[PDB]
Amino acid sequence: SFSGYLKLTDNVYIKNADIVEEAKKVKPTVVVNAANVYLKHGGGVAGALNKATNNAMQVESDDYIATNGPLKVGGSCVLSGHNLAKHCLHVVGPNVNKGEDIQLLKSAYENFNQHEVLLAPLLSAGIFGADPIHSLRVCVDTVRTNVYLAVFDKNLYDKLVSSFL
């Protein structure tokens, strides 16, 4: 199962790891993607997860959008996990670089509560522009299920652990 994680709370764990490498190793039931409303997996975590699936995640996502239309900011959908996981939970955190409301970050993390255990990135962090320290705080105060957070950047991982209240 999950190894090498630091326990932050009763249900939140954290590790300095590449979420693609972590997914290929653990083969979790659920891997969370840092999705946008269009499921266009171009960059950041989404671009990396999609590249690992040889673009199969993008082909499946385009069919999902053609049928259902875009997701809401704060919303999610469950699609295949391809070669990375049983399922991928595509969760849309607000992208503050696109002017999306940061208050929707709690709604985005609420989607994790529908799954007993997840491998996930910090929502709205990285290219989504939010403060990752704030994202971790919203995560621990919102998610009640078991979440294993993979933080790619070592320097950010160290800052997140050393500043965790």
Ligand SMILES: CC(C)NCc1ccc(N(C)C)cc1
């Ligand atoms: C039971 C859990 C640890 N693994 C579920 C599971 C997830 C993904 C895959 N593959 C082959 C991508 C296989 C199995």
